[PDB]
Design a protein around this ligand. Structure first.
Ligand SMILES: [Zn+2]
Ligand SMILES: [Zn+2]
Ligand SMILES: [Zn+2]
Ligand SMILES: [Zn+2]
Lengths: 71, 74
DNA sequence: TTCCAGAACATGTTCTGGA
DNA sequence: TTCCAGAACATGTTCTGGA
């Protein structure tokens, strides 16, 4: 039911983890190309359905921590 | 200024002649320029607001034109 | 039947040049 | 000082091949 990365509604098991579509799409883009990833506030950003956009670097670390994997 | 003329989200300015949010501004540009084939899946009278503007891009674009938006404007 | 990765499709946010 | 168009950047959602 809940996305392990942002607590939004999970659509299913993506890349090894239960996530929503946004996190599924964000993760793949994160590992492939990227998007500026180095936090300012510094690794303590609250990643939820409403503030996930606020910090791209914290979102990804949480994707990794959650154990999402392409391979 | 105040609310978006199209969806009522907070407007960021006058874009293409009308007071719109940034989402509606980018949406209008794509509606006029891209290859689309819009037709309301319902009765062509959907309520377009912040949480629902994604539900029917056909009526959203109709609202944009209605409200006077036009690529030939500031 | 039921599932998901990725492509295809759709949407939203920041930046700032040249007024 | 302030404004916006569009480029560049960033994000989210549908669809379905091939299991
Ligand atoms: Zn998520
Ligand atoms: Zn952060
Ligand atoms: Zn709007
Ligand atoms: Zn409609």
């Amino acid at each position: 039911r809940p996305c392990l990365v942002c607590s939004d509604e999970a659509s299913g098991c993506h890349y090894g983890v239960l996530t929503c579509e946004g996190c599924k799409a964000f993760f793949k883009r994160a590992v492939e190309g990227q998007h500026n990833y180095l936090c300012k506030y510094e690794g303590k950003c609250i990643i939820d359905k409403i503030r996930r956009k606020n910090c791209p670097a914290c979102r990804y670390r949480k994707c990794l921590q959650a154990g999402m994997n392409l391979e």
